[PDB]
Structures are given as structure tokens and as C-alpha cells.
Design a protein around this nucleic acid. Structure first.
Lengths: 116, 143, 155, 144
RNA sequence: ACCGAUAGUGAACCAGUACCGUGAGGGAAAGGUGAAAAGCACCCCGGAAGGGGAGUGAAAUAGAACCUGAAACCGUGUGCUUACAAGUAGUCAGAGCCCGUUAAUGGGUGAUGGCGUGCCUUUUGUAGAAUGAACCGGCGAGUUACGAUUUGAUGCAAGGUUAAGCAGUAAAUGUGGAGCCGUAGCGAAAGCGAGUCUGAAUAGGGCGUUUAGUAUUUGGUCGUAGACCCGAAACCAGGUGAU
RNA sequence: GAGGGUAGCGGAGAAAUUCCAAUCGAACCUGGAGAUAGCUGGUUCUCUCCGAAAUAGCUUUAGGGCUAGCCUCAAGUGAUGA
RNA sequence: UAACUUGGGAGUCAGAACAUGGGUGAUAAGGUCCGUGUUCGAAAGGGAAACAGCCCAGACCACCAGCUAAGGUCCCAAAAU
RNA sequence: GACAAUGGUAGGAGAGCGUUCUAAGGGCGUUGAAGCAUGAUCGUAAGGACAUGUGGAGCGCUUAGAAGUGAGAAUGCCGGUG
């Protein structure tokens, strides 16, 4: 029996064009150009997903350092003091309390200095 | 996902004034640049401008170190064949004390769209009097 | 194939001198209207199996038929004229399903002329029992003489 | 039933098709390699050898000849004769019928491998030295 | 358990026709209204083609360039955004503005920040300024026959098994025991035989004493046939040409 | 100018490898024929486990082969491996 | 925690840089030929501005969680003016 | 439950998706099949459903069998359009 093509090639190419909605120029129209951009998009997302965690950790440290400078002490000196007392509070919770309750963060700063 | 972000509707900007009497050119510029970028604020946002305005008085009477009076040269090109110009740091300080301070500070800021705007909040004056009295500038003590 | 299609002896153009793909014939597979490479070819699909294994393939089918209570024995068919209605009635009396296979000791002309227009009804002889027919049929009706002949001739 | 057919387990396997994409494992080169004589359509070298150094069957000499008048005998051992009951006659006309000799090439030869433990009479074309005494040890006789 | 208009004969249509060549010779593209022509009487714009009504028809965007009607490509209107900016055009984070779904920790757009030099082939090594593709659609490459070996399944078992032919529906089944493999090897051979050859001498040594195979079939590989596909410069034979 | 002759293993050449239908170190058409190509190019669906080599010998051999080394699957022996 | 034997199927025979012992060259070459290791080939991630072979380290998938290696803590740019 | 493993070119092994036809069984369809367009849906992948528009007559589902069975590259062939 002769197996002729039809309704299989077209249904598979239109899925790639749908995934490329919103691209510039021919990158959302032509299958060959749009197919290459989808592979690049998938590779970028895998890399950016793991890189996203480093960027947000560096943002918390920057905000913690700025808030600590107002108490005449540094970031590298503050974090050493907390671990002596065993505070065990990460950067994410340290940053949120340093902008919501500025009085609450002052209590932690005093405790770190007491432990030297 | 509970990280706070700052936008144009909840940002307060202030004005500060700094005097450049007897300060090293690069050491004064290093601390000033961190104020324009808002790095000293706790609500710092890398994609939003959160800095403060800076006024620098006494552009002249700024001190160098070593032999930088005649051994520090600034070059530039006019995009023409063979056209290159130069000037020393000592000559630039007394012919144009304002441009000397601006270039050193502006070279410490990122060269992006937001960085090109954060450098527009710096004001440099050769004398000791500034015309921005309608604002509320406060004296700033260097760290 | 390439040689069977009519025409395509010359070369369409010279090997080099112009900017075009090199071609030898107009009937090559990549062309439109050229020969087909590795298509279907006339052959046969039949094959054989050892004789001892064919006997087991029929006894197993008969045993599977008899386990499910699908084998009934009747007397001779003394039909005098070919009548489809009479065969329909005798099937209804025996309470047989829509698919049924009936065997005869020899070729019964009167039985074969009837029952050959009723859907789901087929007739075979005692000697010519098939493997497909036994599996396909829903019920089996056999005469005692044909049953004895099957028991004797078949192992 | 014709609508539930199950072949014997472990008796059917799907074939392998090459040149059908890279995820299969045999996509581009179809298991051939890169840029060789064996990577072209038309085969490689002869099963023996092609070119190169001298083949093995060329550096060795021929040995022997063959005999036109060669005779081959169908061999029947003593243990194979235990089927026949004791005190009976055995003939090449009977060994073939009984299923012991399928093809009588030039004759029947009795070889003494095993144990007889019988009292039968057998005639054949040739006998071995060992099979001669074993037949006559417990009684009986052999005729050529 | 053959094709269904790029397929099947080159030719489903008045095809060896158009057309190309002095000649021998080469050689296409083109199928479809509707059940029924019932193929738009009549009115309006022109010189006409065409269009808007009315009417026939279940349907006229089924109106004869007529069944459905994808993509490339070309035009109209709209929600968000853009004229200080250095871009493999995306991805992650993200205010502002406009909507409301197969109702789910929803959709469209995008002021700004971080990271980021296409795909395939061939190479020690390619963003490479090494090759290939203008774009979209269709077609386009490990197959079959006969033998060998190996693995799995199944029937019988010191036995296993048919070939041609005859009967039977071109039918899967009976008959057909010529034939083939195995049950015993060694030696160039005569020949001997669980033992044979070499040898003066089982003295030693080599190869045997496993002494369970055989018929069919799925899969892997090889051989003979063009043997995964496309591509020569050339050779031979028979003819056509001094417009 | 008109009517004619010489045909490819051949013709014609005041001789240049010049001409024989825009092509000639051997014309054009059809067949052997799907010639041969150790050479370039191409070879179409998706997942899971394991995972090299660019070395020695020989070669009318050097960008090609064969045997050995190194990889994978199945069945076996059982401390023989570092 | 692997080695050995018998069977089915392959690919490979153009290698490169770095450290070390040599020949050759000129105690020249990103030169060429040998011995001994690592990496690339067939390896993404971090550092060396960018930079296959150098240093650290071997990605089953998801998280806006913690401690470390090579290299670093004035601003670009996270961390000691 | 407890532990251990899961980067990969040439290449070896295994389990699977989808298309066309056939046998048997069982279904859908003018109260609307295939095909075509859209959608914010489902599975680890190739892929599978549902609703709405057009369309006007055929088509799926389960177990088996067979193969002209899967396209982005060959200065590929044919048609259309920049």
C-alpha cells in the first residue's frame, strides 16, 4: 500500500509557529527561521533558570549592607556576629525585616555586637 | 516570592552638598558615585533610579598626589585622520575645574541608559556659591 | 524503476559550464515522473509447517469449541428439496447463534444448495475442515456419521 | 477467537530502520562511519581478501588426492541391536525396515561398541574384530 | 491486505498531439457547479467588461477562471508601544495601560536592569572572511529473491523431515520416502574402527571417544543480483548529416 | 548564382590541430547502460542504560584495506583483578 | 571491585595544546620526531577583560534556601577604604 | 522503605509515538463524517482529546497482520509568490 503524506507534516509545523508568537519579523512567520529561535529559547531558559538564583541572592546582600552601614558597622562584620549567636536567619528574611520594621532590625544588630 | 520592589510612585529623592577642600580627586569621586546610584539606600532596585542629587562646591583647590600635576595627560580624538589632542591635569584644573571633576565621577558609573541619566544629577561649580537654594541641600560628611 | 520509464537516455546539460546541479537523466528518483527505487515487487507470501504440527492446530480448535459447549450432534439431514425457510426453522428449533458451521459426511447437494444464502451460515465437509472456519464460527453442528469419520480419519 | 490473537511470548521482534532521524541512533550515517570504502553503496572487499599481502590460502600447499572407487559402509553398533528380541534372524532387509539403517550406502558393517547381552543371529557384509567375539561370546553365529 | 490526478502507461482531456531539430530523434501541461440547466425574466451606473437589487435553487463567497480552500505574499481598520539611541533580535526580572478564559497562584503590550557572536557539513580546531539554502507547498535514499551462520519461539526425539507430481476454490491438506541432516571417527589413499595416523615400536605425539539432534519461523550479519541514493572525463555497436 | 560528389577506424586542408549545421587532439542520435568512481554531496519520529580511537605488523601501500589493541549485548568459570 | 574464556555487531588507522627527559634546528618557531602525565577531541559551569587544550570543578528535573574551591573585597561589580 | 547510579561524538542494546491498508468484534454520522481555522486543555517525549466557525458524506475504537511508514539542507526536481 502507498502511504502518502498529509495532515501530519502540517500539524507538526504549526505547533512550532504557535510557540513563536510575538517574535520580530519573519521569526514568527517562517517555520525554518522560527524553529531555530525556539531551540535557542529553550537553551536560554535552562541557563537563566539557574542564574536567576544567584542574582536574587546578591540583591539581598546589597540591601543588608546598606541598612547595616547606618549602625556604624559593616556587612561582613554583621554576618559574623549573627552566626556567633546562632541566629540562623537567611538573607531573604533579613532584607524583608530591614525595610518593613526598621525597629525590629535594630534589636538583631545589638545582639550581634554583644557576641562580638 | 515576597521580595519587595520599588517603583516611581514610592521613591523620595534628596539633595546633598559636598565641599572639595583638600580632598584627593579619585577618593572624593569614589564615594560620590555610590550616592548617585542609590547604593546607600535600603530599597535599592537595580532597574529603577533611587539615587539622590549631589552638589559639589569648590571644584578648584583640589589636590593631586605625586607628580600628577604634569604627568597626567588626557587624550581625545576628533574622528579625523591624524587629529589627536591632549591636555595635562594641572592645566585642566585651572582652565576648567568643573570638567575635571565631572569626567572622573562619570567614568565610575555604568554606561547604560539608566547610568547615562543618573549622571545628570551631579552639579559641579568652580567657586564656593551655588544657585540651587530653592531646594533643601544638606552638608554631607565623607566617610 | 529507472530503466522501465520511457525516455531519459541523453544528458540534460553538460557537467560544468553553467550554474546548475549536475544531472544525468530526466527519469532519476529525485525528478518528477522518474522511476521508483525499492518499491513493491510481485511475489508470494505462503509458507509451510511440519505435518505433525498441523494436526495439533485442528484438534486444539475442536477442543476449544467443545469446552464452551458449542458442539451439538444431530441425525442425518433427509432434505428432499432445497428450502431456505425449512433450514431457518430447524436452526431456530436447535437454538443456534447467528454464526454456525455444519459438517457433512460427504458433499450433500441438497443441504449445500440451501443454507448458502443465509448470512453467517457456512457448510463444510468432514474431510475438508478448516482451521479458520472452526475459529470463526460461533457454534458447531455435526452429524453422527461425520463425527465418527472425523474421529477416525483425523488423529 | 479471531479478535483476541496473542503470539507466543518472546517470538516476535520489530525490525530496525536506519536513516529516520537522529533520535533513533542510526540517523545520518546509518551505522557506517565517515569517508571510507566501506561507507559507500556497493560493499567493501571480498570475503577472502582483496589486494594487500598474500592470502592465507595462497601461501599453503595442496595436499592429497581423491579416490574414484571409494566405498562407504553404514555402521551399526552392538548396542543398537538390543531392539530385536533374542533368538531371531537379522538381515539387511530387516535393519532398514526396523529403522536402524536409513541409507545403505555400500553395505552393513557391525562395530563392537557397547554390549550385546542377547542371543541373536545377524548377517552383514563386513564385521570388525571386536564385534566378532562379542556376538559369539554369549552364543550365536555370523554369516557374510 | 495494487494507484487514485506531482500517483497510475509518456498519454483519465481527440497525446506521440503542442513544441524544439536539416535529419535520425526528443517530448509536455490540462479531471470535479448542482439531484435536476431549473445557466439569473425584470430595474439602476457604461461605449463595454464589471457591480448592486429582484428571481431559480437546501445553499449563488455552488454564477460555468464554478466541490472543500493551507502557506509564502499583497492591502484596510483597530488595543498597547516607539524620534539621545550601538541591537544573532531571544531569555530571566519588571512598573504602567487595555481585556476576561477549556477558570487557572488568567490573556495582550512593554519604560528599564542582567546574560547572550544562526543552522547543517567537514575538521586537531569554525561567529567564522571554509561549503549549502531567497521564501512557502508537494515529491525525493538499506528493499526483494535465493543460499550461509547466529540468537529467540514452537512440534517431535536416536531420530527429524519433505521435493517435483496428483486431487482440491489460483483455495492450505490429504497423498507422494527419489532425496537431505544426525546417530563414529582417523588416514593423501588402500584400509582400520572407539580407536586411527605417524612411526621398527600407544614408546611418545596429533586428531577422536561431547558420542542430541532435526523441520519451520521473528530479529542481527554475510554472499550472488545495480543492492542506501544522486554525479563523470571515456569505450563499443547500429544509424543520420557537405542547405 | 543553380544543379551535384567526397561521411567519422572517415572526409577536405597554398598546413593553423583548420573545417565537416552557433560545438571537433576526433561530429550528432539511439542502444550495451542503472558502464565504472578506493572520490565529494545527501540519508526523514521520540525517549532510557553503556561508551571509544586517531596505535603495532603487512600491503603496487601511504586521505584504502586486513589481523591485533581499545567499545557494546548474551551465555559460562569463580578470587584468578587494582 | 573488578579480571578471564567462548559466541553476535561495530567504529577507529589526519590528532592538538600544556608540564617534563631527549634527538634534529640555531640551548629559533604556534617547527618536526620519540618516552611519560593532564585536558580538548566527545565537557556544559566559575577565574584568566574577551580567548577549544591554562587554574577550580564533571550538568536527571524543579526552589526568590545554607556552606565552600580556583580567584577576590575603593566605583563600574557581590564581598575589609 | 534504605542505599547506590543517571555529561556525552563514532558505535552496540532495549522500551515506545504517529501514518496507509487487511481480518474479527463493537460503534458514530444530514438532529451533520473527513478536511480546514481559533482557543487560556492533557501526558516524562514523539503526541491525544473537547468547544466554536466553515464543510457537505463518510469515519473512528480494541486485538492481531503487512509495508511505496515519518523530511530543513543533496549549487536536488516541479508549481506559486517576493
Amino acid at each position: 500500500p502507498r502511504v502518502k503524506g498529509g495532515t501530519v507534516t502540517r500539524a507538526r509545523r504549526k505547533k512550532t509557529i504557535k510557540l513563536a508568537k510575538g517574535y520580530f519579523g519573519s521569526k514568527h512567520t517562517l517555520y525554518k527561521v522560527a524553529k531555530q529561535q525556539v531551540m535557542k529559547s529553550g537553551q536560554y531558559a535552562f541557563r537563566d533558570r539557574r542564574q536567576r538564583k544567584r542574582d536574587f541572592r546578591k540583591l539581598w546582600i546589597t540591601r543588608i549592607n546598606a541598612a547595616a552601614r547606618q549602625h556604624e558597622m559593616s556587612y561582613s562584620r554583621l554576618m559574623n556576629g549573627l552566626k556567633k549567636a546562632g541566629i540562623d536567619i537567611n538573607r531573604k528574611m533579613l532584607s524583608e525585616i530591614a525595610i518593613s520594621d526598621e525597629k525590629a532590625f535594630a534589636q538583631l544588630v545589638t545582639k550581634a555586637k554583644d557576641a562580638l | 516570592r515576597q521580595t519587595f520592589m520599588a517603583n516611581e510612585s514610592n521613591i523620595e529623592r534628596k539633595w546633598y552638598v559636598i565641599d572639595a577642600e583638600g580632598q584627593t580627586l579619585g577618593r572624593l569621586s569614589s564615594e560620590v558615585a555610590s550616592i548617585l546610584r542609590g547604593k546607600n539606600k535600603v530599597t535599592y532596585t537595580p532597574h529603577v533610579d533611587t539615587g539622590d542629587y549631589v552638589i559639589v562646591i569648590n571644584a578648584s583647590k583640589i589636590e593631586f598626589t605625586g607628580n600628577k600635576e604634569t604627568d597626567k595627560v588626557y587624550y581625545r580624538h576628533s574622528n579625523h585622520p591624524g587629529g589627536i589632542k591632549s591636555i595635562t591635569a594641572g592645566e585642566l584644573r585651572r582652565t576648567n575645574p568643573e570638567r575635571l571633576i565631572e569626567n572622573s565621577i562619570k567614568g565610575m558609573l555604568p554606561s547604560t541608559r539608566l547610568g547615562e541619566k543618573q549622571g545628570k544629577k551631579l552639579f559641579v561649580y568652580g567657586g564656593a556659591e551655588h544657585p540651587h537654594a530653592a531646594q533643601q541641600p544638606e552638608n554631607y560628611e565623607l566617610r | 524503476n529507472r530503466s522501465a520509464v520511457s525516455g531519459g537516455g541523453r544528458k540534460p546539460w553538460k557537467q560544468k559550464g553553467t550554474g546548475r546541479a549536475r544531472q544525468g537523466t530526466i527519469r532519476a528518483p529525485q525528478w518528477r515522473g522518474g522511476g521508483i527505487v525499492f518499491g513493491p515487487t510481485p511475489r508470494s507470501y505462503a509458507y509451510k509447517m511440519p505435518k505433525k504440527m498441523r494436526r495439533l492446530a485442528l484438534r486444539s480448535a475442536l477442543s476449544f469449541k467443545v469446552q464452551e459447549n458449542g458442539l451439538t450432534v444431530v441425525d442425518a439431514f433427509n432434505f428432499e428439496a432445497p428450502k431456505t425457510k425449512e433450514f431457518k426453522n430447524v436452526l431456530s428449533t436447535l437454538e443456534q447463534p447467528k454464526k454456525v458451521l455444519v459438517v457433512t459426511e460427504n458433499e450433500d447437494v441438497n443441504v449445500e444448495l440451501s443454507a448458502r444464502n443465509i448470512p453467517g451460515v457456512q457448510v463444510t465437509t468432514a474431510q475438508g475442515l478448516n482451521v479458520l472456519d472452526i475459529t470463526n464460527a460461533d457454534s458447531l453442528v455435526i452429524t453422527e456419521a461425520a463425527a465418527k469419520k472425523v474421529e477416525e480419519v483425523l488423529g | 477467537k479471531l479478535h483476541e490473537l496473542k503470539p507466543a511470548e518472546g517470538s516476535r521482534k520489530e525490525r530496525n530502520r536506519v536513516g529516520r532521524g537522529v533520535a533513533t541512533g542510526n540517523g545520518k550515517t546509518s551505522g557506517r562511519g565517515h569517508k571510507g570504502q566501506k561507507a559507500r553503496s556497493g560493499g567493501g572487499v571480498r570475503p577472502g581478501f582483496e589486494g594487500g599481502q598474500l592470502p592465507l590460502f595462497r601461501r599453503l600447499p595442496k595436499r592429497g588426492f581423491t579416490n574414484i572407487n571409494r566405498k562407504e559402509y553404514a555402521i551399526v553398533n552392538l548396542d543398537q541391536l538390543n531392539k530385536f528380541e533374542d533368538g531371531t534372524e537379522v538381515t539387511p532387509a530387516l535393519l532398514v525396515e526396523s529403522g536402524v539403517v536409513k541409507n545403505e550406502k555400500s553395505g552393513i558393517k557391525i562395530l563392537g561398541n557397547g554390549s550385546l547381552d542377547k542371543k541373536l543371529t545377524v548377517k552383514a557384509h563386513k564385521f570388525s574384530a571386536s564385534a566378532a567375539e562379542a556376538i559369539d561370546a554369549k552364543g550365536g553365529a555370523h554369516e557374510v
